[PDB]
Structure formats: C-alpha cells, structure tokens
C-alpha cells in the first residue's frame, strides 16, 4: 500500500491547520489511527511539508530506539498532541487535544531522505 514516507504524512502532517478541543477526536479518526485500536498517543505537525522534510538535514540526534538517523528541528514548530482519555473505549476513541510550539525530532530514511517516523517533541 502506502510508502513509509506517505504513512508519516498521513499520521503526522496537518499543514492546513496553523485547533479546537474536538480536533484530535476528528483527526485521529479521519486519518485512520483508530481503525484497529485507539492509538494511545499521536502528534500532528502544523508546518509546511517542505519545512518538515528540511528537518532531515538539521540537527542529528539519537533516536529513542538507539538508531542514529533522527533529526531535531533548529526552530520550534506548531504541533498538536493527541493523548487518549480514560473514558475512551474502542471503537469510540476519545482524545485530549493539546496545542504547543516545540522542536520536533523525526527519523529519516530513503532516497529522497525524508521523514518516516515522529520520534519526539522537545
């Protein structure tokens, strides 16, 4: 099906938004992150695809899993953190929408060298 690069865009990119308390509940479902099970946590980046792809040539840092192909953004980025609530019961996945401006860390692979995993936000 979709490529790893495509999967990263589907799960983590949302350039349209620069949202509401309903954001995560709507996005987690629309992006198919609650099809099999309620994905515990997920982050959406509100920056252009170009700016995010550019992170692959920025600050090289260690990935949480120990791999060395992670990169941290030199500048902060608008992001939205989605964290599953306690009352949330599949298929009705409920999330807590939390906006913030932090540096993101993504794992990059391939040719072209592009983001394939969202590792963290600091």
Binding residues for substrate: 7, 10, 39-43, 64, 83
Active site residues: 12, 117
Residues 70 and 107 sit within 8 Å (Cβ to Cβ): yes
Number of domains the chain contains: 1
* CATH number of the CATH domain containing 91: 3.10.130.10
Distance (Å) of CA 49 to CA 81, 95, 110: 18, 25, 16
Residues making up the annotated binding site are: 7, 10, 39-43, 64, 83
Q: In terms of residue numbers, what domain contains 88?
A: 1-122
């Amino acid at each position: 099906k979709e490529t790893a690069a495509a999967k990263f865009e589907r799960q983590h990119m949302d350039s349209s938004t620069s949202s509401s308390s309903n954001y995560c509940n709507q996005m987690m479902k629309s992006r198919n992150l609650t099809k099999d099970r309620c994905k515990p946590v997920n982050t959406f980046v509100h920056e252009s695809l170009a700016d995010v792809q550019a992170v692959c040539s920025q600050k090289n840092v260690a990935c949480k899993n120990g791999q060395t192909n992670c990169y941290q953004s030199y500048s902060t980025m608008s992001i939205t953190d989605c964290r599953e609530t306690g009352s949330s019961k599949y298929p009705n996945c409920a999330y807590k929408t939390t906006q913030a401006n932090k540096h993101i860390i993504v794992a990059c692979e391939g040719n072209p060298y592009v983001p394939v995993h969202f590792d963290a936000s600091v």
